[PDB]
Amino acid sequence: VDMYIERAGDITWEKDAEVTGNSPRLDVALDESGDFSLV
C-alpha cells in the first residue's frame, strides 16, 4: 500500500571501485529483537 520499489541498477562487481573502510574484529551479541550490541 504505502511502500513501493524502483530500480536503482544492476548487481555487478565494478573493476575500478574505490577501496576504503576498516576491518575491525568486534565482540557482539544479537538479541531476540534483532539488535546487535557491543560486548
Partner: protein, 154 residues
C-alpha cells in the same frame, strides 16, 4: 516488474518521497531487511509484492518467494558494498570485511557509514554474487558504524 537488480524502497507517507531502504530482486523474489518494511506488502508499479518469509531476529524478509541468496563471504577476500543512498546514484564501495564475533559464530562486517535509508543494499563477492545485506550493525567506541554482512538461509 520482476527484473533482477537492486531497488530502492520508497514511501510517500511522510514529507515528499522518502527512501526507507534498499533491496535485491533475484529469481523473482524481492529480498530486503525486516526493519525496512516491517513485513508490509510493497508495490511494484501496478502490481503487488506480498511478504513470503521473514524473521525479526535475522532482520530479513523476502517477497513473492523464499529467500534465494546463498553466497557467503569467504573470510579472506575483499567485497563490494553496492550502496544505494537516498537521492544518490548507486555506487560500488570496495572494502575488506571485519568480523562480528558472537557466541553462535562469526560473520563478516563492513565498516562503512551511510544514511539509514541505505539499509538493504547488497554486498557482493568478486563473482558478482550477493553475500548478504547491509544495514544491521553497531556503533563502535569511535562513534562510527559497522554493519554485519546479513545473509539468509535457503
Amino acid at each position: 516488474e520482476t527484473t533482477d537488480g537492486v531497488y530502492r524502497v520508497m514511501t510517500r507517507r511522510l514529507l515528499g518521497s522518502t527512501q526507507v531502504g534498499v533491496g535485491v530482486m533475484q529469481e523473482g523474489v524481492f529480498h530486503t531487511m525486516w526493519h525496512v518494511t516491517k513485513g508490509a506488502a510493497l508495490r511494484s508499479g501496478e502490481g503487488r509484492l506480498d511478504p513470503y518469509w521473514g524473521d525479526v531476529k535475522q532482520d530479513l524478509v523476502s517477497y513473492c518467494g523464499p529467500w534465494k541468496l546463498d553466497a557467503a563471504w569467504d573470510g579472506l577476500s575483499e567485497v563490494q558494498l553496492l550502496a544505494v543512498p537516498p537521492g544518490e546514484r548507486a555506487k560500488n564501495i570496495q572494502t575488506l570485511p571485519g568480523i562480528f564475533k558472537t557466541k553462535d559464530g562469526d560473520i563478516g562486517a563492513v565498516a562503512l557509514d551511510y544514511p539509514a535509508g541505505t539499509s538493504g543494499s547488497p554486498i557482493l563477492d568478486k563473482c558478482g554474487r550477493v553475500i548478504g545485506l547491509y544495514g544491521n550493525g553497531v556503533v563502535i567506541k569511535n562513534g562510527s558504524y559497522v554493519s554485519a554482512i546479513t545473509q539468509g538461509k535457503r
